[PDB]
């Protein structure tokens, strides 16, 4: 390699402080250390988690940072000990890591690895506690263990899923978070049953992923709910048999859904991050056995509430992180399902744009006119 | 039978108004209308559910009425159409019905029959909207579908479980409420796996049934929590391995449990009815997969709260009504298990008194002098 062992200069989008546009300038990326992988991103998408940390909402937010966490790339070099991947391999960097040995990687019903989360959340690396980006000798900090807003990034060995070398990296960059989450929420968390009734709250990428997996699961009725009727026709494509605007009704949205279905829906998914809607989705879960899965991320410190009656009479409140998928073992599986023509992964992307335009991708987001925009360099 | 079709003059305990003593006088019990069943009560027990309504704290309350809902007895006569039982059958009248045909009886995960609840909730019979007790002509209303504080009572067919002729009626009366709830919380709602860790909050009858079942499910560790440490000996007898008093500790009780285990207990049970503890029980359920079952009924107007993060990071909130036991189907199955010699059911009875002393039995309940007090005629 020209590059291996050497630092690397490349074009990144740096966030200097919150609530403020991104600076597409140049960055130096250190060589990878023990148990690390330097990845060359080739495509990367925008997620609402990214705009949320840009808004000063994250308590653990650490500026300056390189945002970005939905991406695919190519291994460029690895540090010492790294036997899982080798330069040339095609990868998806995963904010949710996989160790194989900790308590949660072993339990069949979780994926909340504790391998490296102590450090990715502070923005640094495990080998020496310091980050790996630099701008004029001053450190830039990592976000969510990935930082896919640079041409090259360095990530923990536990965070790289190796994928089929023949998958289009400008499509499966979506499998690195948002779309996987909505899929797993149905398949792993809720385990949606054939013939069930589903109600999804919020028809963004995640929301539509839920609706997709719900059809693939045999849902006999999928109710979609958004305060944006211009999301309905795409939602009916992905499989929604019903579309509801809460503003079109007086009764609270929960009582509305309980009315169309008599008792509620077998499964309800909240893909917004609003605690009022969360409580609402629980309360239109079906009496006696309904499940509500909280998918979205709320403002830190904000609370959800309901009446204990809603659970003493049969509903179940749960959540999901990255759809419950065990990243490294199972993200290669999602690529495989993609490569068998089984998903609608292609329909999720609405805009391909170049990385110099990152800041206008954020304004196309903040207005909800796209679902997902893949950026290439 | 000398009493089929006639009214019966029997001894009973009438709640004339809230917050006064009951009156042990004679009452007139109509014969069973269609689909109804008249039952000679041979033993009956007290619950604090009876006290809370007698105390004037029920919004659903209706006076005068005849409380009592944990009993066992013998069919005296049956109304028109009734084939499931016959005179001489031994029965447990359950406050939770089983009709076999509503959409909750045909579902594996519920026991919340809707066939008669609209009429029992108002102390009447479904067949004509009216009660079946009278004094001097004026009507006395039912309680919970059962009204077991009377030598004879009239109940809905859907409410009558047919049990072994060899069970001692002065022990299985417990199976119509509190013990079943606690057991069913473990076996049906949580399904505690062998080897796992449990915390129980509240060491009354329900909480002890939770411990008992948790030991029998094979739980490696059972943590009992209560602010009255004088319940720790008996809790230990039922299979506990630790005892916590939240007042001994200078941090939130959910921190104590989460520190005694590394990440919380795999299952937690709230057996009090106190929404703050409800949240504590949820927040000390194991990260990633923990399950919290609300078993206690909160004061009306209270609300459970947590941060949505708690659910996203893998905890599941749920609850249970009568242990999710499909009453008429499975209460016979619990009576059979009892007689196999597999349960500690006899150990929940702390006193045996005469029906004339129902009021001293109610003063014992108010002080904790009493797990379950059983009355006979
Ligand atoms: N749990 C996880 O592992 C995980 C992973 C990825 C994303 N997320 C969270 O999922 C949420 C959604 O992800 P996205 O990328 O789909 O967001 P997105 O913003 O594309 O979708 C937002 C949708 O919410 C709708 N909405 C807003 N308020 C509403 C209301 N009151 N009633 C009905 N609809 C309403 C908007 O109209 C819009 O369509 C985000 O909060 C993100 O943080 C969670
Ligand atoms: N879900 C159902 O179908 C069903 C059926 C029957 C009863 N229940 C509910 O179960 C609950 C209890 O049943 P019981 O027979 O155990 O009642 P009980 O009153 O004997 O038990 C009360 C216990 O709670 C403990 N307690 C009170 N505040 C506490 C705190 N802050 N922290 C820790 N411990 C505390 C007391 O010390 C006492 O031991 C009731 O609220 C009742 O509504 C539910
Ligand atoms: Zn995301
Ligand atoms: Zn791990
Ligand atoms: Zn009771
Ligand atoms: Zn029914």
């Amino acid at each position: 390699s020209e590059t291996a062992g050497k630092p690397i200069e490349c074009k990144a989008a740096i966030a200097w402080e919150a609530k403020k546009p991104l600076e597409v300038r140049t960055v130096t990326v250190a060589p990878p250390g023990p148990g690390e992988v330097r990845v060359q991103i080739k495509a990367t998408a925008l997620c609402q988690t990214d705009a949320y940390t840009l808004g000063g909402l994250d308590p653990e937010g650490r500026f300056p940072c390189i945002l970005g966490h939905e991406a695919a790339g190519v291994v460029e070099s690895v540090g010492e000990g790294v036997t899982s991947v080798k330069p040339g391999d095609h990868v998806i960097p995963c904010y949710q890591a996989y160790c194989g040995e900790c308590k949660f990687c072993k339990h069949p019903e979780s994926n909340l690895c504790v391998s490296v989360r102590a450090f990715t959340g502070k923005g640094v690396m495990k080998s020496d506690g310091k980050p790996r980006f630099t701008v004029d000798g001053k450190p830039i900090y990592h976000f969510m263990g990935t930082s896919t807003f640079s041409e090259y990034t360095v990530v923990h060995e536990q965070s790289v899923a190796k994928i089929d070398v023949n998958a289009p990296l400008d499509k499966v960059c979506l499998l690195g978070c948002g779309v996987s989450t909505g899929w797993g929420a149905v398949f792993n968390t809720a385990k949606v049953t054939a013939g069930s009734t589903v109600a999804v709250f919020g028809l963004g990428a995640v929301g539509l992923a839920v609706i997709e997996a719900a059809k693939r699961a045999g849902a006999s009725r999928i109710i979609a709910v958004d305060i944006d009727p211009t999301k309905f026709p795409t939602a009916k494509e992905f499989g929604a048999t019903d579309c509801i605007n809460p503003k079109d009704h007086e009764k609270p949205i929960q009582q509305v859904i309980v009315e169309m279905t008599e008792w509620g829906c077998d499964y309800t998914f909240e893909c917004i991050g609003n605690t009022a809607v969360m409580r609402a989705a629980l309360e239109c879960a079906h009496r006696g056995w309904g499940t509500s899965v909280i998918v979205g991320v709320a403002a830190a410190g904000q609370e959800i509430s309901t009446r204990p009656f809603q659970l003493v009479t049969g509903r179940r409140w749960m959540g999901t992180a990255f759809g419950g998928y065990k990243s490294r073992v199972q993200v290669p599986d999602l690529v495989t399902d993609y490569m068998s023509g089984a998903t609608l992964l292609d329909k999720y992307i609405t805009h391909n744009m170049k990385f110099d335009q990152i800041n206008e991708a954020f304004e196309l987001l903040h207005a909800g006119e796209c679902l997902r925009c893949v950026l290439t360099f």
Side-chain angles (χ1 to χ4, degrees), chain A residues 48-49 95 177-178 181 202-206 225-228 231 246 271-274 277 295-297 320-322 372:
Chain A
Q48 262 292 13
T49 302
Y95 63 99
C177 175
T181 297
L203 317 168
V206 177
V225 178
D226 205 306
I227 58 161
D228 187 336
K231 309 219 145 72
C271 328
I272 313 161
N274 175 326
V277 194
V295 192
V297 170
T320 202
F322 187 56
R372 271 301 180 284

PDB file of all heavy atoms in Angstrom, chain A residues 48-49 95 177-178 181 202-206 225-228 231 246 271-274 277 295-297 320-322 372, ligand 1:
ATOM      1  N   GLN A  48     -31.666  10.887  10.943  1.00  0.00           N
ATOM      2  CA  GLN A  48     -32.144  11.934  11.848  1.00  0.00           C
ATOM      3  C   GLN A  48     -31.331  12.001  13.137  1.00  0.00           C
ATOM      4  O   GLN A  48     -31.224  13.077  13.735  1.00  0.00           O
ATOM      5  CB  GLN A  48     -33.624  11.750  12.168  1.00  0.00           C
ATOM      6  CG  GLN A  48     -34.575  12.614  11.320  1.00  0.00           C
ATOM      7  CD  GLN A  48     -34.483  14.126  11.594  1.00  0.00           C
ATOM      8  OE1 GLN A  48     -33.554  14.608  12.253  1.00  0.00           O
ATOM      9  NE2 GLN A  48     -35.477  14.873  11.111  1.00  0.00           N
ATOM     10  N   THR A  49     -30.757  10.876  13.581  1.00  0.00           N
ATOM     11  CA  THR A  49     -29.806  10.899  14.694  1.00  0.00           C
ATOM     12  C   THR A  49     -28.662  11.893  14.442  1.00  0.00           C
ATOM     13  O   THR A  49     -28.126  12.486  15.387  1.00  0.00           O
ATOM     14  CB  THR A  49     -29.253   9.477  14.935  1.00  0.00           C
ATOM     15  OG1 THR A  49     -30.329   8.564  15.198  1.00  0.00           O
ATOM     16  CG2 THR A  49     -28.295   9.434  16.120  1.00  0.00           C
ATOM     17  N   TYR A  95     -22.592   1.323  14.350  1.00  0.00           N
ATOM     18  CA  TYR A  95     -22.497   1.991  15.648  1.00  0.00           C
ATOM     19  C   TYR A  95     -22.696   1.002  16.794  1.00  0.00           C
ATOM     20  O   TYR A  95     -22.057   1.138  17.849  1.00  0.00           O
ATOM     21  CB  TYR A  95     -23.477   3.156  15.762  1.00  0.00           C
ATOM     22  CG  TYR A  95     -24.940   2.790  15.677  1.00  0.00           C
ATOM     23  CD1 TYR A  95     -25.716   2.660  16.825  1.00  0.00           C
ATOM     24  CD2 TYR A  95     -25.563   2.625  14.447  1.00  0.00           C
ATOM     25  CE1 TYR A  95     -27.072   2.358  16.755  1.00  0.00           C
ATOM     26  CE2 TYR A  95     -26.914   2.321  14.364  1.00  0.00           C
ATOM     27  CZ  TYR A  95     -27.666   2.191  15.526  1.00  0.00           C
ATOM     28  OH  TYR A  95     -29.012   1.893  15.468  1.00  0.00           O
ATOM     29  N   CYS A 177     -28.030   1.262   9.622  1.00  0.00           N
ATOM     30  CA  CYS A 177     -28.785   1.780  10.754  1.00  0.00           C
ATOM     31  C   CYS A 177     -30.285   1.866  10.469  1.00  0.00           C
ATOM     32  O   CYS A 177     -31.043   0.958  10.828  1.00  0.00           O
ATOM     33  CB  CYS A 177     -28.249   3.156  11.167  1.00  0.00           C
ATOM     34  SG  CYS A 177     -29.207   3.945  12.483  1.00  0.00           S
ATOM     35  N   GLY A 178     -30.712   2.960   9.827  1.00  0.00           N
ATOM     36  CA  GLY A 178     -32.126   3.312   9.797  1.00  0.00           C
ATOM     37  C   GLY A 178     -33.028   2.212   9.278  1.00  0.00           C
ATOM     38  O   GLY A 178     -34.011   1.849   9.929  1.00  0.00           O
ATOM     39  N   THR A 181     -33.060  -1.002  11.352  1.00  0.00           N
ATOM     40  CA  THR A 181     -33.760  -0.865  12.622  1.00  0.00           C
ATOM     41  C   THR A 181     -35.241  -1.169  12.470  1.00  0.00           C
ATOM     42  O   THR A 181     -35.815  -1.928  13.258  1.00  0.00           O
ATOM     43  CB  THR A 181     -33.556   0.535  13.186  1.00  0.00           C
ATOM     44  OG1 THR A 181     -32.164   0.728  13.460  1.00  0.00           O
ATOM     45  CG2 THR A 181     -34.338   0.699  14.472  1.00  0.00           C
ATOM     46  N   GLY A 202     -45.227   7.350  11.937  1.00  0.00           N
ATOM     47  CA  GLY A 202     -44.114   8.101  11.365  1.00  0.00           C
ATOM     48  C   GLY A 202     -43.482   7.476  10.132  1.00  0.00           C
ATOM     49  O   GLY A 202     -42.637   6.582  10.240  1.00  0.00           O
ATOM     50  N   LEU A 203     -43.840   7.954   8.951  1.00  0.00           N
ATOM     51  CA  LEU A 203     -43.474   7.250   7.726  1.00  0.00           C
ATOM     52  C   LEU A 203     -42.214   7.818   7.082  1.00  0.00           C
ATOM     53  O   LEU A 203     -42.177   8.065   5.878  1.00  0.00           O
ATOM     54  CB  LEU A 203     -44.656   7.266   6.770  1.00  0.00           C
ATOM     55  CG  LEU A 203     -45.879   6.968   7.643  1.00  0.00           C
ATOM     56  CD1 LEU A 203     -47.184   7.234   6.924  1.00  0.00           C
ATOM     57  CD2 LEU A 203     -45.830   5.539   8.173  1.00  0.00           C
ATOM     58  N   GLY A 204     -41.162   8.012   7.880  1.00  0.00           N
ATOM     59  CA  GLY A 204     -39.818   8.175   7.361  1.00  0.00           C
ATOM     60  C   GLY A 204     -39.200   6.850   6.926  1.00  0.00           C
ATOM     61  O   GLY A 204     -39.891   5.852   6.695  1.00  0.00           O
ATOM     62  N   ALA A 205     -37.868   6.846   6.803  1.00  0.00           N
ATOM     63  CA  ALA A 205     -37.182   5.633   6.363  1.00  0.00           C
ATOM     64  C   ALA A 205     -37.493   4.469   7.295  1.00  0.00           C
ATOM     65  O   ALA A 205     -38.068   3.458   6.883  1.00  0.00           O
ATOM     66  CB  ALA A 205     -35.678   5.884   6.282  1.00  0.00           C
ATOM     67  N   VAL A 206     -37.135   4.605   8.566  1.00  0.00           N
ATOM     68  CA  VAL A 206     -37.523   3.661   9.607  1.00  0.00           C
ATOM     69  C   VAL A 206     -38.993   3.257   9.497  1.00  0.00           C
ATOM     70  O   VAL A 206     -39.312   2.067   9.394  1.00  0.00           O
ATOM     71  CB  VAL A 206     -37.237   4.263  10.991  1.00  0.00           C
ATOM     72  CG1 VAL A 206     -37.699   3.336  12.084  1.00  0.00           C
ATOM     73  CG2 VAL A 206     -35.763   4.586  11.114  1.00  0.00           C
ATOM     74  N   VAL A 225     -49.454   6.285   9.908  1.00  0.00           N
ATOM     75  CA  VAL A 225     -49.884   7.516  10.569  1.00  0.00           C
ATOM     76  C   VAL A 225     -48.768   8.548  10.456  1.00  0.00           C
ATOM     77  O   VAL A 225     -47.654   8.313  10.939  1.00  0.00           O
ATOM     78  CB  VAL A 225     -50.240   7.267  12.047  1.00  0.00           C
ATOM     79  CG1 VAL A 225     -50.642   8.553  12.722  1.00  0.00           C
ATOM     80  CG2 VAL A 225     -51.358   6.223  12.172  1.00  0.00           C
ATOM     81  N   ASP A 226     -49.055   9.689   9.825  1.00  0.00           N
ATOM     82  CA  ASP A 226     -48.100  10.795   9.790  1.00  0.00           C
ATOM     83  C   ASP A 226     -48.859  12.118   9.705  1.00  0.00           C
ATOM     84  O   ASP A 226     -50.002  12.164   9.238  1.00  0.00           O
ATOM     85  CB  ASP A 226     -47.108  10.648   8.619  1.00  0.00           C
ATOM     86  CG  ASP A 226     -45.782  11.373   8.874  1.00  0.00           C
ATOM     87  OD1 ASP A 226     -45.815  12.584   9.179  1.00  0.00           O
ATOM     88  OD2 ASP A 226     -44.703  10.747   8.774  1.00  0.00           O
ATOM     89  N   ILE A 227     -48.211  13.200  10.175  1.00  0.00           N
ATOM     90  CA  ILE A 227     -48.731  14.566  10.023  1.00  0.00           C
ATOM     91  C   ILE A 227     -48.196  15.177   8.737  1.00  0.00           C
ATOM     92  O   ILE A 227     -47.932  16.382   8.664  1.00  0.00           O
ATOM     93  CB  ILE A 227     -48.399  15.482  11.221  1.00  0.00           C
ATOM     94  CG1 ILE A 227     -46.899  15.576  11.473  1.00  0.00           C
ATOM     95  CG2 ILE A 227     -49.140  15.029  12.461  1.00  0.00           C
ATOM     96  CD1 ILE A 227     -46.496  16.808  12.316  1.00  0.00           C
ATOM     97  N   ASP A 228     -48.056  14.344   7.710  1.00  0.00           N
ATOM     98  CA  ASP A 228     -47.570  14.781   6.404  1.00  0.00           C
ATOM     99  C   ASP A 228     -48.224  13.875   5.370  1.00  0.00           C
ATOM    100  O   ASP A 228     -47.701  12.802   5.044  1.00  0.00           O
ATOM    101  CB  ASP A 228     -46.045  14.710   6.331  1.00  0.00           C
ATOM    102  CG  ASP A 228     -45.485  15.303   5.049  1.00  0.00           C
ATOM    103  OD1 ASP A 228     -46.220  15.363   4.041  1.00  0.00           O
ATOM    104  OD2 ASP A 228     -44.297  15.701   5.050  1.00  0.00           O
ATOM    105  N   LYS A 231     -46.489  11.759   2.569  1.00  0.00           N
ATOM    106  CA  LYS A 231     -45.814  10.496   2.811  1.00  0.00           C
ATOM    107  C   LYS A 231     -46.730   9.302   2.605  1.00  0.00           C
ATOM    108  O   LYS A 231     -46.254   8.163   2.586  1.00  0.00           O
ATOM    109  CB  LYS A 231     -45.242  10.477   4.229  1.00  0.00           C
ATOM    110  CG  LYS A 231     -44.414  11.712   4.545  1.00  0.00           C
ATOM    111  CD  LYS A 231     -43.199  11.363   5.373  1.00  0.00           C
ATOM    112  CE  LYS A 231     -41.987  12.232   5.027  1.00  0.00           C
ATOM    113  NZ  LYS A 231     -42.101  13.644   5.507  1.00  0.00           N
ATOM    114  N   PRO A 246     -53.318  12.392  12.030  1.00  0.00           N
ATOM    115  CA  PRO A 246     -53.935  12.707  13.327  1.00  0.00           C
ATOM    116  C   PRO A 246     -54.607  14.075  13.346  1.00  0.00           C
ATOM    117  O   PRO A 246     -55.582  14.266  14.091  1.00  0.00           O
ATOM    118  CB  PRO A 246     -52.755  12.627  14.306  1.00  0.00           C
ATOM    119  CG  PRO A 246     -51.690  11.865  13.565  1.00  0.00           C
ATOM    120  CD  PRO A 246     -51.861  12.241  12.139  1.00  0.00           C
ATOM    121  N   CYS A 271     -42.004   5.476  15.253  1.00  0.00           N
ATOM    122  CA  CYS A 271     -40.738   5.843  14.616  1.00  0.00           C
ATOM    123  C   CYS A 271     -40.601   7.343  14.456  1.00  0.00           C
ATOM    124  O   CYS A 271     -40.306   7.805  13.353  1.00  0.00           O
ATOM    125  CB  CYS A 271     -40.599   5.198  13.246  1.00  0.00           C
ATOM    126  SG  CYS A 271     -41.381   3.622  13.128  1.00  0.00           S
ATOM    127  N   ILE A 272     -40.813   8.099  15.539  1.00  0.00           N
ATOM    128  CA  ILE A 272     -40.682   9.553  15.499  1.00  0.00           C
ATOM    129  C   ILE A 272     -39.715  10.058  16.562  1.00  0.00           C
ATOM    130  O   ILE A 272     -38.832  10.874  16.273  1.00  0.00           O
ATOM    131  CB  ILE A 272     -42.045  10.240  15.654  1.00  0.00           C
ATOM    132  CG1 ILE A 272     -43.063   9.585  14.721  1.00  0.00           C
ATOM    133  CG2 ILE A 272     -41.880  11.714  15.393  1.00  0.00           C
ATOM    134  CD1 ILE A 272     -44.497   9.830  15.075  1.00  0.00           C
ATOM    135  N   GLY A 273     -39.860   9.589  17.793  1.00  0.00           N
ATOM    136  CA  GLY A 273     -39.072  10.127  18.880  1.00  0.00           C
ATOM    137  C   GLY A 273     -39.803  11.124  19.753  1.00  0.00           C
ATOM    138  O   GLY A 273     -39.159  11.783  20.586  1.00  0.00           O
ATOM    139  N   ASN A 274     -41.129  11.224  19.603  1.00  0.00           N
ATOM    140  CA  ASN A 274     -42.000  12.128  20.351  1.00  0.00           C
ATOM    141  C   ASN A 274     -42.719  11.337  21.447  1.00  0.00           C
ATOM    142  O   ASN A 274     -43.432  10.371  21.147  1.00  0.00           O
ATOM    143  CB  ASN A 274     -42.979  12.777  19.361  1.00  0.00           C
ATOM    144  CG  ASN A 274     -44.038  13.659  20.004  1.00  0.00           C
ATOM    145  OD1 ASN A 274     -44.505  13.410  21.103  1.00  0.00           O
ATOM    146  ND2 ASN A 274     -44.425  14.707  19.289  1.00  0.00           N
ATOM    147  N   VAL A 277     -46.532  10.639  21.187  1.00  0.00           N
ATOM    148  CA  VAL A 277     -46.901   9.598  20.240  1.00  0.00           C
ATOM    149  C   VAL A 277     -46.558   8.228  20.810  1.00  0.00           C
ATOM    150  O   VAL A 277     -47.319   7.262  20.647  1.00  0.00           O
ATOM    151  CB  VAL A 277     -46.205   9.861  18.894  1.00  0.00           C
ATOM    152  CG1 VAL A 277     -46.819   8.997  17.772  1.00  0.00           C
ATOM    153  CG2 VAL A 277     -46.286  11.340  18.571  1.00  0.00           C
ATOM    154  N   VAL A 295     -39.250   2.678  18.724  1.00  0.00           N
ATOM    155  CA  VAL A 295     -38.120   2.706  17.796  1.00  0.00           C
ATOM    156  C   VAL A 295     -37.355   4.024  17.876  1.00  0.00           C
ATOM    157  O   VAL A 295     -36.123   4.029  17.916  1.00  0.00           O
ATOM    158  CB  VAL A 295     -38.596   2.442  16.348  1.00  0.00           C
ATOM    159  CG1 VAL A 295     -37.410   2.189  15.459  1.00  0.00           C
ATOM    160  CG2 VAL A 295     -39.588   1.299  16.286  1.00  0.00           C
ATOM    161  N   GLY A 296     -38.089   5.145  17.922  1.00  0.00           N
ATOM    162  CA  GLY A 296     -37.471   6.452  17.875  1.00  0.00           C
ATOM    163  C   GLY A 296     -36.783   6.834  19.171  1.00  0.00           C
ATOM    164  O   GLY A 296     -37.031   6.272  20.235  1.00  0.00           O
ATOM    165  N   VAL A 297     -35.915   7.837  19.059  1.00  0.00           N
ATOM    166  CA  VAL A 297     -35.089   8.330  20.157  1.00  0.00           C
ATOM    167  C   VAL A 297     -35.621   9.695  20.585  1.00  0.00           C
ATOM    168  O   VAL A 297     -35.738  10.614  19.764  1.00  0.00           O
ATOM    169  CB  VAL A 297     -33.609   8.401  19.744  1.00  0.00           C
ATOM    170  CG1 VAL A 297     -32.768   9.140  20.792  1.00  0.00           C
ATOM    171  CG2 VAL A 297     -33.069   6.986  19.448  1.00  0.00           C
ATOM    172  N   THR A 320     -36.164  -0.930  21.012  1.00  0.00           N
ATOM    173  CA  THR A 320     -35.218  -1.628  20.156  1.00  0.00           C
ATOM    174  C   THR A 320     -34.042  -0.702  19.890  1.00  0.00           C
ATOM    175  O   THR A 320     -34.186   0.526  19.865  1.00  0.00           O
ATOM    176  CB  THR A 320     -35.882  -2.119  18.846  1.00  0.00           C
ATOM    177  OG1 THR A 320     -35.114  -3.191  18.291  1.00  0.00           O
ATOM    178  CG2 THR A 320     -36.067  -1.006  17.783  1.00  0.00           C
ATOM    179  N   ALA A 321     -32.867  -1.301  19.760  1.00  0.00           N
ATOM    180  CA  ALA A 321     -31.678  -0.578  19.336  1.00  0.00           C
ATOM    181  C   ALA A 321     -31.124  -1.280  18.111  1.00  0.00           C
ATOM    182  O   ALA A 321     -30.770  -2.465  18.179  1.00  0.00           O
ATOM    183  CB  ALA A 321     -30.634  -0.517  20.446  1.00  0.00           C
ATOM    184  N   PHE A 322     -31.060  -0.551  16.994  1.00  0.00           N
ATOM    185  CA  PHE A 322     -30.568  -1.120  15.748  1.00  0.00           C
ATOM    186  C   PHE A 322     -31.346  -2.402  15.448  1.00  0.00           C
ATOM    187  O   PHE A 322     -30.784  -3.429  15.063  1.00  0.00           O
ATOM    188  CB  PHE A 322     -29.048  -1.355  15.827  1.00  0.00           C
ATOM    189  CG  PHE A 322     -28.425  -1.785  14.543  1.00  0.00           C
ATOM    190  CD1 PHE A 322     -28.568  -1.030  13.399  1.00  0.00           C
ATOM    191  CD2 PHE A 322     -27.690  -2.963  14.483  1.00  0.00           C
ATOM    192  CE1 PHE A 322     -28.003  -1.443  12.203  1.00  0.00           C
ATOM    193  CE2 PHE A 322     -27.119  -3.383  13.301  1.00  0.00           C
ATOM    194  CZ  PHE A 322     -27.279  -2.623  12.153  1.00  0.00           C
ATOM    195  N   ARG A 372     -33.928   9.229   2.423  1.00  0.00           N
ATOM    196  CA  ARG A 372     -32.514   8.935   2.589  1.00  0.00           C
ATOM    197  C   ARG A 372     -31.808   9.484   1.364  1.00  0.00           C
ATOM    198  O   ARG A 372     -32.218   9.170   0.237  1.00  0.00           O
ATOM    199  CB  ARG A 372     -32.269   7.420   2.702  1.00  0.00           C
ATOM    200  CG  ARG A 372     -32.331   6.873   4.089  1.00  0.00           C
ATOM    201  CD  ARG A 372     -31.320   7.531   4.966  1.00  0.00           C
ATOM    202  NE  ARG A 372     -31.393   6.984   6.307  1.00  0.00           N
ATOM    203  CZ  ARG A 372     -32.343   7.290   7.185  1.00  0.00           C
ATOM    204  NH1 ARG A 372     -33.306   8.155   6.865  1.00  0.00           N
ATOM    205  NH2 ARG A 372     -32.327   6.730   8.392  1.00  0.00           N
TER     206      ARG A 372
HETATM  207  N1  LIG C   1     -33.761   2.600  18.046  1.00  0.00           N
HETATM  208  C1  LIG C   1     -32.759   2.599  17.057  1.00  0.00           C
HETATM  209  O1  LIG C   1     -31.864   1.735  17.004  1.00  0.00           O
HETATM  210  C2  LIG C   1     -32.833   3.675  16.008  1.00  0.00           C
HETATM  211  C3  LIG C   1     -32.082   3.621  14.842  1.00  0.00           C
HETATM  212  C4  LIG C   1     -32.218   4.634  13.893  1.00  0.00           C
HETATM  213  C5  LIG C   1     -33.099   5.711  14.093  1.00  0.00           C
HETATM  214  N2  LIG C   1     -33.832   5.756  15.239  1.00  0.00           N
HETATM  215  C6  LIG C   1     -34.807   6.899  15.484  1.00  0.00           C
HETATM  216  O2  LIG C   1     -35.907   6.644  14.650  1.00  0.00           O
HETATM  217  C7  LIG C   1     -36.573   7.932  14.463  1.00  0.00           C
HETATM  218  C8  LIG C   1     -37.003   8.061  13.015  1.00  0.00           C
HETATM  219  O3  LIG C   1     -35.945   7.707  12.185  1.00  0.00           O
HETATM  220  P1  LIG C   1     -36.165   8.554  10.582  1.00  0.00           P
HETATM  221  O4  LIG C   1     -34.732   8.513  10.094  1.00  0.00           O
HETATM  222  O5  LIG C   1     -37.337   7.757  10.123  1.00  0.00           O
HETATM  223  O6  LIG C   1     -36.836   9.987  10.988  1.00  0.00           O
HETATM  224  P2  LIG C   1     -37.600  10.877   9.831  1.00  0.00           P
HETATM  225  O7  LIG C   1     -37.628  12.211  10.541  1.00  0.00           O
HETATM  226  O8  LIG C   1     -37.326  10.532   8.400  1.00  0.00           O
HETATM  227  O9  LIG C   1     -39.313  10.516   9.902  1.00  0.00           O
HETATM  228  C9  LIG C   1     -39.926  11.486  10.665  1.00  0.00           C
HETATM  229  C10 LIG C   1     -41.404  11.315  10.460  1.00  0.00           C
HETATM  230  O10 LIG C   1     -42.105  11.585  11.682  1.00  0.00           O
HETATM  231  C11 LIG C   1     -43.323  12.194  11.276  1.00  0.00           C
HETATM  232  N3  LIG C   1     -43.891  12.820  12.459  1.00  0.00           N
HETATM  233  C12 LIG C   1     -43.346  13.821  13.279  1.00  0.00           C
HETATM  234  N4  LIG C   1     -44.149  14.155  14.290  1.00  0.00           N
HETATM  235  C13 LIG C   1     -45.285  13.332  14.127  1.00  0.00           C
HETATM  236  C14 LIG C   1     -46.488  13.215  14.877  1.00  0.00           C
HETATM  237  N5  LIG C   1     -46.651  14.010  15.980  1.00  0.00           N
HETATM  238  N6  LIG C   1     -47.467  12.302  14.496  1.00  0.00           N
HETATM  239  C15 LIG C   1     -47.190  11.541  13.364  1.00  0.00           C
HETATM  240  N7  LIG C   1     -46.095  11.556  12.550  1.00  0.00           N
HETATM  241  C16 LIG C   1     -45.146  12.485  12.979  1.00  0.00           C
HETATM  242  C17 LIG C   1     -42.831  13.253  10.242  1.00  0.00           C
HETATM  243  O11 LIG C   1     -43.934  13.656   9.511  1.00  0.00           O
HETATM  244  C18 LIG C   1     -41.833  12.389   9.415  1.00  0.00           C
HETATM  245  O12 LIG C   1     -42.432  11.668   8.388  1.00  0.00           O
HETATM  246  C19 LIG C   1     -35.510   9.056  14.764  1.00  0.00           C
HETATM  247  O13 LIG C   1     -35.889   9.712  15.949  1.00  0.00           O
HETATM  248  C20 LIG C   1     -34.213   8.257  14.965  1.00  0.00           C
HETATM  249  O14 LIG C   1     -33.433   8.757  15.995  1.00  0.00           O
HETATM  250  C21 LIG C   1     -33.729   4.760  16.214  1.00  0.00           C
END
